[PDB]
Symmetry: D3
Subunit: 260 residues, 6 copies
């Protein structure tokens, strides 16, 4: 068993339920490490499909990045082995389909985490936001790339530049979501689709998933461009605005951004 | 003339109509060779726009891959010079617009074929499925790439992982189709658009179509990533699951997939 | 002060209004040079969001390329330093969000210009046309790429191959627009969103916009493929049809295109 | 047979000898067209290796570009379908090895031509120069790339920026040549190697040559970078220096370049 | 201990000596499994440099790919999981320098194996041959790429198209070898350089080795290019010539290749 | 005038001579800023070729990075806007040839700096070392790439992993240098080559230099690969070994590296 997730297996379908309500499923390292161990434990031939969910009735799916752990003092908080970076890679490389089954509000990092999964099925009352511009966080290239494969550029720029929540109905209309259903039908609807997928050829599913992963990633640039972007990101991590954004969040006041 | 298609010219518009209804327009080599010969014959200055259709009233637009013609195992079923791979390249490189005018159900390789065309106009009763996971087929990279330029990744993954049919209305909503019209209006609506395009500058249409083709292919990877994918595909077409999927289709029974 | 635009700033938002209505805000060099000088003058820390608009009541937002300035005698009219090519680079590199606020009809180069901006908010009565196939112009690779990040390939090919106008409602459905509002709400809706964005962290917005720009351009090809495309574009600008297309537009008649 | 080349077949080896000594085997269209026809006619299973040579005793192997064929009004003489661009593609795509067997002096485009070939075996008295900076020519990307696969960057820059001739001995030392032999041994040495190659597996040789060709071309860039370089090339073709360079060559006088 | 290698440790340097003299150290699956197990066992902080060697006095360093383990026809002979493909990836990714210390003749896959290593130091009597065109084998893109990072294209094509051995002196001159020494001095010359490297910063060496590996592999192409190459390779491994090459090796006779 | 360089012009040739001998021309910010200002000031049409040199008789050409300019620990000394990273970009983008004329010993970042220049002409007594593995520095991707365009991979790895000096004669043999001259002839040999280059077409030289620069950069990878390398570099900067290497150099003792 796991301290911060609960796993149920129903024939070939596994359901990983978040059990980190004390921090509204914020992406703390101890929570992500249990999620990753639970997924790893389910990498077996007789499991064919995974569902990720918050507990039934939750008002919050996930509060996103744990801002108490998101480091300040000049260190990159979205480095390659930071937990959100590790779990998006693991979801994308996992040789079985991973369905995000969403009840409640989805924030920032948690939005990138469900976007990295294969299908999203949501309650009609679920809401979605992408929040780095609230804190002054320079989100990393891979993280931003994970948000560009479903809705168009103008829609993605609206979500990130405003940090405003969208409804499940709008998330469906712009192509983020697969299905929107009444919260009382959410579990039944998602399990029926997961059981259906689990009757199909798992080795064909795994290789087509991996072919889509590498095509998704196949936007290539030279070393100079990457080093230029990393220089820009470091200037943001070094800014007064980044300190102000983190402090304003921890102090629950409105930040005063000044552009240095 | 052609054994397996019928061609009509109306001013500058050519309509290539399938004539393989006894096999529900499955993509047998003999059918695809005729479709490619008809297209090549229509590469003339006086032809400005192509329409591909099934006969009026067809229940099945195309049953997709001829499963009899797939090599039984140990052999890549979607090699570069296999007929579906040849026709999709030919459609994409053809210097005139090609409009798929769809009445009936569209399956598997035939869904890839229409996705490779420039515009899709469909009857309100048409249905669309992508079926390789029903048989355990390791669909090839170029083939999967051809399904990713219209609908988002989560939608494409639902289509491929479930192999379930979608309606014309849902295909329109997610960005696969240009237009949905009542079946009685399908021929007139599509001919009106083709005659319209036929008065525009053909050399500008041809170079813009080619620019889009190159940009659409310009997802690049290193040799190791490609060879790693090919090794994964070979493990699938070497698998007992692939033989069981082919056999269950030919024997009209439900396959039992086990993951090797 | 500018001859061809008017700028109003309130707090952190700047509105750049076209003042070239006597030529339907055609993208003449004198107008684009003024737009670029006004943007450069607004690249200051206290400015956080830009709106581009035509005057209230405009029937035509922009007529697109000035056909009286398009090179005739064997010269590429969309070379790297042509004014449309310069303004789209400047908008995409600009470290503040740029919102296109659209009232009236949008044509050709002007459609590319608004697509290059970060968000589009349009009146319910606005219309959008992409017109190079009306003139026989071989649109350049960068320009075509700018049109492919919002709507899918089939939709983009319909817009370009037909040159037919689409409504704001359809432009919203296919993913081109962020929002459609009644024209009497257009300024208030856009100002509210622009002022909302200006309260967010500008250095995070700037680096995320630049990350999106780099990822969007990261469709790479070898020198041979680019030189092949250049040769195709040159044969179009050397074409009888290209001369006929320009001549027809000047003589206010319908072109007769013949395919050389 | 051919006006401008002579072909001798010895067992499985074909020797293509230039017959344009009147014009020092300058790369005139009529000469290159005959060279490409003779090569095409030798694409038969019983031919296994090609040797390209000047006649025995030639002082000049090839004088490079024909000045009398560069079409002024700025028009790019290194466009995709100009004769030298066509013959380098054809040599690189030719499914048999092509050995350049060099006696005499090699100039400019003829240096690019022999670099495009598979092996170079040269007389101890042969000499090599790359000459576009003598004329003010903006050599094209693919043409420059063809010069970068043998010697290192500093060496290539010395050859191009000086336009000075190098000895066979230096060309061997820096990795441009395979072998340097006394002129009396040049046919024996070259034919012994060609005959040896002709006993090897031709389908393996062809696919490995094509693998090397694609790996050699696999330096990829985005559309913006290509268009930028094209703009710089156009600026050189529009320059006063380019006119001066061509006029000085025609008037047999030293050019005076001024940097515009 | 290992059945097919012997390992010595001298301070911080490990020497892996082949013990498969009965097949002249041909790269059989069981030999490569022990070489890889010995490398994995040595991946410890107190080991800082590896030497690969054949036993003292060896006439044959390695006879290369085990021809008996190649498939009969119709199957890719150089698939991603093939032993040669596994060992070259493991050498390249190994976080310590691997020096090939060469006494005797080096053939085919064994030449690719030493080329994949970091440094090559060779006896003055050693020789080097690349032999797939002797057997009609379609070498893979990754394998060919591993041969292109030291000598120029003209030299590499000579080596592969001739399958002729070159001396240690010529291999030094063209950039393949670091050093050539008399055989009596080979062991202690190599150990002196490995001990010197072992005093340097191992984490710096590892990240620089990895940066060079990524840069070396960063020649990118699109899916269609790779699948076109793979189809050409399949025509070769399906050919009569491939069968003839395998049979000629088994019957110890000269192959008769015909080009199908 | 400049505090840290001396500039002499001889008609079209400019010679930038280091004036930082009391610190062995270490690459301190104040010294690089003066070199960059002196280059910027020579970017004039009447200047056609630059020579970089140390004063006549210098024992040390440049000692490389100023180790007394390491920033606050946990921080990258090879970030995009560090002076060495700035001047190598500026040399590579400079629209005139830059020749490194080397007398004395060349170390570390100074080796990268001369490698980034267009030609290197050296005294027979000059020596060359690449030194980051002496200190435990994770040299950055762009910096390593700048070392890979002249000599082959095996040679570069020997230089980097040994940090051992090589002679001028060995640097010529492996392709690093253009020419080696007796020290009394060095200045005149280098000036005659610079005057010769200055007679050639400057716009042709500039565009070919720029085309070589972008081809040399055109090794592309995806975001995940770049971020994975940055994670490894950061782990090296965070290591005990990195502290030990910098402290050892400051204290003039042998470092004790332990591999964490
Ligand atoms: C990637 C990224 C992010 O993900 O940024 C973080 C985005 N997240 C957010 O803005 C949401 C932050 N949380 C909230 O606004 C509220 O907690 C919401 C979700 C509306 C729920 O309000 P609520 O009144 O029901 O509950 P709270 O009392 O606020 O929260 C319940 C508990 O979870 C803690 N918590 C909630 N969100 C957290 C977060 N993101 N990080 C750390 N702790 C969090 C909170 O401190 C409290 O703990 P404690 O008892 O120790 O004080 N980014 O920056 O780009
Ligand atoms: O109108 P609007 O929605 O554009 O305004 P916003 O301020 O962007 O967002 C409206 C509110 O929803 C909050 N919010 C952000 N992400 C959210 C999400 N995923 N679900 C629900 N609420 C969210 C946001 O923090 C703000 O909180 P609060 O009013 O407590 O400050
Ligand atoms: C991507 C991919 C594919 O393209 O795979 C194949 C996907 N297609 C399918 O699964 C649909 C296969 N066909 C069917 O399911 C049924 O024929 C459907 C479409 C429901 C219609 O049924 P129906 O009762 O009306 O008609 P049928 O008798 O089944 O079919 C009419 C005739 O066409 C033949 N046929 C149908 N589908 C075929 C196929 N895919 N390949 C070869 N022959 C086929 C069938 O054997 C019959 O011939 P015969 O009379 O000689 O036996 N893939 O799997 O890799
Ligand atoms: O229910 P559902 O629609 O969600 O999902 P499925 O069971 O996958 O699909 C429902 C039925 O539609 C069939 N089908 C697959 N592709 C199809 C297409 N393009 N058009 C029509 N039917 C299709 C599928 O084979 C199945 O038939 P059958 O029940 O005989 O096996
Ligand atoms: O083609 C390039 C971009 N695409 C365009 O179609 C541009 C113009 N397209 C149009 O459809 C119409 O001009 C639109 C924009 C709807 C305007 O229609 P309208 O009913 O308001 O009036 P028009 O008669 O079309 O236009 C009024 C005048 O402005 C001129 N004009 C319009 N667009 C122009 C352009 N892009 N470049 C140069 N002149 C233009 C037009 O030639 C006419 O000529 P003249 O100066 O001799 O009077
Ligand atoms: O003398 P150098 O070797 O230093 O350099 P350059 O001046 O460029 O070259 C010396 C002379 O050899 C000529 N030359 C150039 N390439 C040549 C080649 N491949 N073979 C023989 N001579 C050549 C060059 O045109 C110049 O002509 P001319 O004497 O009429 O001026
Ligand atoms: O690509 C594959 C690369 N390999 C090659 O092309 C080289 C293969 N072999 C040769 O060139 C010669 O065997 C070399 C290595 C020079 C050694 O010549 P040799 O005359 O001393 O010894 P051989 O007797 O030829 O070889 C000793 C034994 O090892 C066998 N052998 C040699 N190379 C082999 C290989 N690459 N794979 C499998 N078996 C091999 C050979 O068939 C013989 O078997 P048997 O005892 O059953 O007859
Ligand atoms: O590390 C980056 C690569 N640089 C090096 O390897 C260090 C350069 N120095 C040496 O290697 C040798 O000392 C060489 C270059 C041959 C210089 O000859 P040398 O031995 O006679 O001169 P040094 O003894 O090193 O001493 C000359 C002075 O310049 C200092 N110095 C040398 N290299 C330096 C560097 N890269 N950064 C800062 N200071 C340096 C050195 O510490 C000494 O300072 P101080 O007076 O505070 O002790
Ligand atoms: K011909
Ligand atoms: Ni893309
Ligand atoms: Ni079994
Ligand atoms: Ni390269």
């Amino acid at each position: 068993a796991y301290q911060y997730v609960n796993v149920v297996t129903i024939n070939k379908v596994a359901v990983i339920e978040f059990n980190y309500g004390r921090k509204l499923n914020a992406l703390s390292k101890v929570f992500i490490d249990d999620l990753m161990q639970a997924l790893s434990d389910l990498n077996r031939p007789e499991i064919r499909c995974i569902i990720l969910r918050a507990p039934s009735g939750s008002k919050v799916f996930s509060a996103g990045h744990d801002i108490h752990e998101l480091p300040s003092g000049g260190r990159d908080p979205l480095s390659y082995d930071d937990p959100l970076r590790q779990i998006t890679r693991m979801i994308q490389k996992f040789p079985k389909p991973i369905i995000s089954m969403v009840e409640g509000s989805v924030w920032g990092g948690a939005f990138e985490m469900i976007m990295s999964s294969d299908l999203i099925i949501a309650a009609s009352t679920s809401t979605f936001s992408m929040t780095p511009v609230n804190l002054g966080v320079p989100y990393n290239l891979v993280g931003i790339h994970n948000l560009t494969r479903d809705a168009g550029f103008h829609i993605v720029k609206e979500l990130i530049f405003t940090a405003s929540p969208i409804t499940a109905q709008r998330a469906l209309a712009v192509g983020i979501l697969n299905h929107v259903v009444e919260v009382e039908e959410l579990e039944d609807f998602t399990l029926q689709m997961a059981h259906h997928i689990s009757e199909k050829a798992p080795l064909a599913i795994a290789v087509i998933k991996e072919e889509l992963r590498v095509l998704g990633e196949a936007h290539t640039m030279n070393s100079d461009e990457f080093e230029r972007i990393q220089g820009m990101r470091r200037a943001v991590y070094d800014s007064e605005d980044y300190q102000e954004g983190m402090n304003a969040f921890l102090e629950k006041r409105k930040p005063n951004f000044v552009g240095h």
